[PDB]
Every structure is written in structure tokens, then in C-alpha cells.
Design a protein around this ligand. Structure first.
Ligand SMILES: CCOC(=O)Nc1cc(-c2ccc(C)c(NS(C)(=O)=O)c2)nn2c(C)nnc12
Length: 117
């Protein structure tokens, strides 16, 4: 059903989502919630969109998921001002996920994914 790469991506996604208990990043931000969001943020991203990309096999590396995760956090730091709870939640999530998506974990997974070919 799923490739070893897809399974690794999902395990990383579950660790990243454990760092968003308030659930701000679960689903796309709507303009109803955040007026003008669609005019400000050119490339929206959220965890549910990322989980669909994993399911549809749109990622060919962990690094592409890592780029989408960084994009998701920095979008929140562009739309929301530094003093806001969403900016500070994004900054904390980005820092936590950069260790969850560590280059060391990526290297380890690359080997075990390669050996499962
Ligand atoms: C105009 C005031 O500014 C905002 O309301 N901005 C933002 C708000 C929220 C937010 C709120 C409440 C909830 C329940 C959620 N979760 S959901 C339904 O989207 O999964 C998200 N996320 N957010 C993200 C990311 N980036 N900016 C914002």
C-alpha cells in the first residue's frame, strides 16, 4: 500500500503535528478567519495539505516535505505581526520541527529507505 518513503514521511508528520497542540496549522487558513490572507500569502500550506501530498505520492524526498513545513511556518510569520500568538506559535513550531526534520534523521532514513528497495 505505502512505500517506505511515504511511511517515513507520515511518521515525521505525526511528530510535527504533536508540536501544534493548539491546532493552528491543521487545515488551510481561510480569509474568513484571516482577512486578506489569500492576497498576502502566495503559497499557502498546512498539515492536511501535506498529508494529502504524502498520500498522493507528491513528495520524492524528505527535503521537499521539509521545505513545505518551513513554508507553512514562515507564512504565519509574514501574515501575523511578531507580537501575536500565531507568530510566536509559528516561530516555536519552526524551531522544533527543524530538529525533528534534522539532517541526521534524514540521513538515517535515506539509508533504511534505500535498503528497503
Ligand atoms: C486575523 C487574525 O489573524 C488570524 O486569525 N491568523 C491565523 C489564525 C489561525 C487559526 C485560528 C484558529 C483555529 C482553530 C485555527 N485552526 S485551522 C481551522 O485553521 O486549522 C487556525 N491560524 N493561522 C495561521 C496558521 N497563520 N495565521 C493564522
Amino acid at each position: 500500500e505505502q512505500t517506505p518513503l511515504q511511511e517515513a514521511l507520515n511518521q515525521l508528520m505525526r511528530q510535527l503535528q504533536r508540536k501544534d497542540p493548539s491546532a493552528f496549522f491543521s487545515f488551510p487558513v481561510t480569509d474568513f478567519i484571516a482577512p486578506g490572507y489569500s492576497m498576502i500569502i502566495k503559497h499557502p500550506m498546512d498539515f492536511s495539505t501535506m498529508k494529502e501530498k504524502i498520500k498522493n505520492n507528491d513528495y520524492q524526498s524528505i527535503e521537499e516535505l521539509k521545505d513545505n513545513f518551513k513554508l507553512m511556518c514562515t507564512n504565519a510569520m509574514i501574515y501575523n505581526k511578531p507580537e501575536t500568538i500565531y507568530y510566536k506559535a509559528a516561530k516555536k513550531l519552526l524551531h522544533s520541527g527543524m530538529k525533528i526534520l534534522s539532517q541526521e534523521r534524514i540521513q538515517s532514513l535515506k539509508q533504511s529507505i534505500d535498503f528497503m528497495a
